[PDB]
Design a protein around this nucleic acid. Structure first.
Lengths: 52, 49, 49, 34, 225, 187, 147, 124
RNA sequence: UGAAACCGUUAAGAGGUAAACGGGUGGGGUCCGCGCAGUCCGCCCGGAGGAUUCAACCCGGCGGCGGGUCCGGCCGUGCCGG
RNA sequence: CGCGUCCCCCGCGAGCGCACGGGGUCGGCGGCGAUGUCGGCUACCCACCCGACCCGUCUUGAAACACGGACCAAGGAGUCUAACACGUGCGCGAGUCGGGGGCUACGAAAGCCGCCGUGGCGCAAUGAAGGUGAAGGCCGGCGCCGCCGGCCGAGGUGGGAUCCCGAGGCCUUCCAGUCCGCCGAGGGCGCACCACCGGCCCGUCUCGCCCGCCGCGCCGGGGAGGUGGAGCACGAGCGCACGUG
RNA sequence: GAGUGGCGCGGACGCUACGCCGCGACGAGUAGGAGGGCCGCUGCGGUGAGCCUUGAAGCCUAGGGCGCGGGCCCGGGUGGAG
């Protein structure tokens, strides 16, 4: 129920949203995972440009 | 940046510039006084009248 | 100096309180070298603490 | 203040070397524990 | 070489000292003149009556300038209009007292809060002890005791009310600065009547305590003061 | 039993700043001393403003410290601000200004000082003028803030030109029934 | 900080600051934006006027880049180019005017709000307002169109 | 400065010791040993310390020198006074009055030294 | 480790208005003060003692300071010259 | 209660001491005490006097013949996430912010990027939309009218904290006379803010005349006066944190 | 308030300025709101040259206290590792 001058706001949480919560504890490990692969590729494409 | 550049308000407040432009310190402490009566105390009545 | 002692460090006997040492210290490879430096800068009483 | 004193540099034996660094303006930044 | 400023600081102290003596003598002689007034005031009312009585006529004396209003009822279960008039009289507590000078804009207020006040025409001795014993001044909106004349002289000195006696003269002989002299006085914190109230709820006429008691406020002022 | 309403017998002003910063709190200790001791009513108003919240001392734009100092009978006078001086970029020429502010934005510093102006703090304003004599005490616009457009008479009340709280404005976000004679009514 | 909160000062009470008569029940007004035309009408009328109903034409596949036209006023037109140019414009003898490419700095229209300082310009702006034209011509300049 | 690094220390120093509705300061050069601006023995330019000797008997007087204050090692000159009580309490009065060296701590230093010479006096 | 409810036993106390309760004292305890000749502190006045023993005076040392205006450094959210 | 002098009827003497004098002292004393007495407000048990119904709860009202509770231990209930609002703290400030990406034990941290500011929000609004999109008056060249020209030019009124000016006056055997400080009749600049009046931009309506041109039209621009707008009128926001709803 | 004019080496306390001091007035309270906790709990970063097998936590108590209160500190007994 609206109390006073508020914003007529509509949250999109009427579905079973808690099942499909994508958390980002992967992020710092992912940035290392991508970086390790980027290095290992650059050393493979040996005298060639790293960026492609 | 600094909000104030001289942080020492020991030296600022006893600088000749500030000390010149104050009033006199009212350091004397005035406690409450008893109400003596007209007919009880004669020389309280001699002070008022 | 006052803040570092209020933080709790035993710097009573430290030389200067921005304790800047030579770049010979970055050449060190053993702890016996690292110990002797902190004895001579008199930071060791903080390691002892 | 805005003065920057002449910071000595100490030899590995704990005694003063000849060299002096000027105290960086970093060390005269406002002390805000907040 | 300090020989100047030694004596100059004494010359100040003597000028401060001799000035208080002149102020003391004024306070002494203003007090002696009001004695001479109160005599002539008290005497001429008996005089005008005797010459009325000799001729066979009546001296209807001056309808009184000055009333002393005491709140007799409590703070609980009170009308909104009665609450307002009692708190414009500064009677915000049971057995609080204020002097209220009579007119049309006084009595039509006092008759509207009749059941909650015992009031009447105070004496000279009643105005004395109320000002001497129970005398407190509203100085910096604080209830400070009138123990030296320099508290009345500092607040009321701009109206030439410069001692305890000038205040009493200003109240009793309702002066041109009665308002400022009476509003200076904090509403008097009087004790419960030592002897007993007759009946709080009913009017004084019907063997009660409430309303106008013309000469008889003074008996209960001495019962309460 | 005294009929006193204890509703309004606590005054709800600041008697210190809520901030715990020690450069602002040392400025208060200085103007605690000056305000009560110096009879000047300047230092009292400054002390009050040193307490006040971020919103209550809003940023005075440089182009107000131009305009309100250009005014007649204000030559060789120091503009005193308890907020901050922000560099207004839609002013071109900048005069010599004597400035007292808690902060100055790094743009407005380089603007004022280059144009033969001087910037002070409140420890300096103290040593220069302890009574704050020969000072223009300025303030930024307090009703400047976006928040005051939503305040007052409610939006959807006759002759209330008040901004409503809308998620995101457009053509189909509170435009119909209470805003058009075609759709129901119009306030 | 759970310790700074109101919940900690409501240990020892009973209702936990939600009334003794009207208890903290689950949804006693309906969920979300319910009763907007029924029992929450007065809130919606007083605070959200226009909420119910249609207006205007539906535009199905609206792309926000076709209707991209970011505007700069004449108030801050000189801030697009370096302060050196405004200095070098006045002092030099030729009467050469500096070019303010308004599209280079990322605006497509020049609106005419500010007092424009009395020295010439050439403004290579994509669109112009009618006043913004008159102000630049008044100071003595060009309103060069560009695409 | 003194008034600055007080506002950091006042509530969060390692020497500050709060319990039993009482506050103290266990600093090397606090005398009266209480949490104060005046008596704080780190934060002022001029600081008077009164400590008992490294041997059994006497009082050492720690005068914080004016020059090297960012130099912790050379910042204090220590002078041990092993004399009679009346002339120990005199020497400390003369070090403070007749050098003008922080004269607010003139009487506190004499009261401390007095309570140190009383301490190292044998109990019956 | 061994809490409370609850029970036993021992010790002390009391018991016809169910018990318990608040306020006010009295009584008996258990324990404590580890009570039970009852404060130290200056300064001064007298007595009989002791001690390497003050003021002053040099001599080296160390610090504070201001020297209206000694010399030289060094730093400038200070400029003005190349 | 002097006189050195100014006239209406005939600027500081020294001491002493008592006190109905800005809240109590005595320069008065007196019994007692090592195996049985001294102190101990509380706490243990008991007795007496007065008071005294059983709590939680919904309720107009509960000690209720209203409901829950035999007793004790442990467990046990306004959370976290998202959004929004407003207050407050911090940073920067017409900007602001890397949050996504990238670069280099604690550390899955921290530090850095700016030709990573894409993008978000703010800096511009209004309109259904096409779209449009935020001061002027003067002095002249042809008692005027659109070009030609020139300088100064972001309102006004009222109230306004703060400053500003200073008619006069604040004393040592005079009296002039200057430097500072302080007070002040009265007078001005007026911050923010508020009310008011005019202005400007967008929508629409009414009345009306004049401009522009590679494309002279069912073209484009402009004016005076009403009115609709979540606007302008020398920016305040952005990020973060905390609190409450 | 300033200028040229006619012997004895001495003086309490204080001011954690978020501190300290002074003076007047006032004090019911459910729902409810706010403030202050040197109130308590369990973990983290600091710090206290903290305490602890010469005895930690816990637990018991007719022991001594403190605080308006939430609670807390001591003494004794038990206990064995924080």
């Amino acid at each position: 129920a609206p109390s006073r001058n508020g914003m007529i706001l509509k949250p999109h949480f009427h579905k079973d949203w808690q099942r499909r919560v994508a958390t980002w504890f992967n992020q710092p490990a992912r940035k290392i995972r991508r970086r390790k692969a980027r290095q290992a590729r650059a050393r493979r494409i040996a005298p060639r440009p790293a960026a492609g | 940046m600094h909000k104030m550049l001289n942080t020492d308000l020991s030296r600022i407040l006893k600088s000749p510039e500030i000390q010149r432009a104050l009033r006199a310190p009212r350091k004397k402490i005035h406690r409450r006084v008893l109400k003596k009566n007209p007919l009880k105390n004669l020389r309280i009545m001699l002070k008022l009248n | 100096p006052a803040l570092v002692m209020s933080k709790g460090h035993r710097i009573e006997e430290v030389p200067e309180l921005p304790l800047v040492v030579e770049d010979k210290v970055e050449g060190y490879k053993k702890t016996k070298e690292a110990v002797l430096l902190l004895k001579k800068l008199k930071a060791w009483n903080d390691i002892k603490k | 203040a805005c003065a920057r004193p002449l910071i000595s540099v100490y030899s590995e034996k704990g005694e003063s070397s000849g060299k002096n660094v000027t105290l960086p303006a970093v060390f005269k930044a406002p002390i805000r524990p907040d | 070489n300090f020989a100047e400023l030694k004596i100059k600081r004494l010359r100040k102290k003597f000028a401060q000292k001799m000035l208080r003596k002149a102020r003391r003598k004024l306070i002494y002689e203003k007090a002696k003149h009001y004695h001479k007034e109160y005599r002539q005031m008290y005497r001429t009312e008996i005089r005008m009556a005797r010459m009325a009585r000799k001729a066979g006529n009546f001296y209807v004396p001056a309808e009184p300038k000055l009333a002393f209003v005491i709140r007799i009822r409590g703070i609980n279960g009170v009308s909104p209009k009665v609450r307002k008039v009692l708190q414009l009289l500064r009677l915000r507590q049971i057995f609080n007292g204020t002097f209220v000078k009579l007119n049309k804009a006084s009595i039509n207020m006092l008759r509207i809060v009749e059941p909650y006040i015992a009031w009447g025409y105070p004496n000279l001795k009643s105005v004395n002890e109320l000002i001497y014993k129970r005398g407190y001044g509203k100085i910096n909106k604080k209830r400070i005791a009138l123990t030296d004349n320099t508290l009345i002289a500092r607040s009321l000195g701009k109206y030439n009310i410069i001692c305890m006696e000038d205040l009493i003269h200003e109240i009793y002989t309702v002066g041109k600065h009665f308002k400022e002299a009476n509003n200076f006085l904090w509403p008097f914190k009087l004790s419960s009547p030592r002897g007993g109230m007759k009946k709080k709820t009913t009017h004084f006429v019907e063997g009660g305590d409430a309303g106008n008691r013309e000469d008889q406020i003074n008996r209960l002022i001495r019962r309460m003061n | 039993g005294v009929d006193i309403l204890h509703n309004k017998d606590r005054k709800v002003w600041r008697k210190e700043p809520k901030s715990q910063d020690m450069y602002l709190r040392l400025l208060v200790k200085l103007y605690r001393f000056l305000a009560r001791h110096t009879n000047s009513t300047f230092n009292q108003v400054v002390l009050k403003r040193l307490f006040m919240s971020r919103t209550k001392r809003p940023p005075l734009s440089l182009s107000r410290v131009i305009r309100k100092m250009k005014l007649p009978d204000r030559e060789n006078k120091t503009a005193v601000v308890v907020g901050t001086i922000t560099d207004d970029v839609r002013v071109q020429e900048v005069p010599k200004l004597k400035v007292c502010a808690l902060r100055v934005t790094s743009r407005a510093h380089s603007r004022i000082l280059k144009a033969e102006g001087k910037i002070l703090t409140f420890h300096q304003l103290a040593l220069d003028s302890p009574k704050g004599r020969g000072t223009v005490l300025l303030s930024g616009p307090r009703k400047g803030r976006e928040v005051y457009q939503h305040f007052g008479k409610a939006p959807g009340t006759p002759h209330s030109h008040t901004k409503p709280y809308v998620r995101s404005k457009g053509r189909k976000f509170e435009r119909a029934r209470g805003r058009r004679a075609s759709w129901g009514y119009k306030n | 900080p759970s310790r700074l909160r109101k919940t900690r000062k409501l240990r020892g009470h009973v209702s936990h600051g939600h009334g003794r008569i009207g208890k903290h029940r689950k949804h006693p007004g309906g969920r979300g934006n319910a009763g907007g035309m029924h029992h929450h009408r007065i809130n919606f009328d007083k605070y959200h006027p226009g909420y119910f109903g249609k207006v205007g034409m539906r535009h199905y596949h609206l792309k926000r880049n076709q209707s991209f036209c970011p505007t700069v006023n004449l108030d801050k037109l000189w801030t697009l180019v370096s302060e050196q140019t405004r200095v070098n414009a006045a002092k030099n003898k030729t009467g050469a005017a500096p070019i303010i490419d308004v599209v280079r700095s990322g605006y497509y229209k020049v609106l005419g709000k500010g007092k424009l300082p009395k020295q010439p310009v050439i403004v290579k702006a994509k669109f112009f307002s009618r006043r913004a034209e008159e102000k630049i011509k008044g100071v003595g300049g060009a309103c060069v169109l560009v695409a | 400065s003194a008034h600055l690094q007080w506002m950091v220390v006042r509530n969060c120093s390692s020497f500050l010791i709060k319990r039993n509705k009482q506050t103290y300061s266990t600093e090397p050069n606090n005398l009266k040993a209480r949490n104060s601006f005046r008596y704080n023995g780190l934060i002022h330019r001029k600081t008077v310390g009164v400590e008992p000797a490294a041997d059994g008997k006497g009082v050492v007087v720690v005068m914080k020198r004016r020059s090297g204050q960012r130099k912790p090692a050379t910042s204090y000159v220590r002078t041990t006074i092993n004399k009679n009580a009346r002339a120990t309490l005199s020497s400390i009065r003369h070090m403070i009055r007749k050098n003008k060296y922080h004269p607010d701590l003139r009487m506190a230093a004499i009261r401390r030294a007095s309570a140190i010479l009383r301490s190292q006096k044998p109990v019956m």
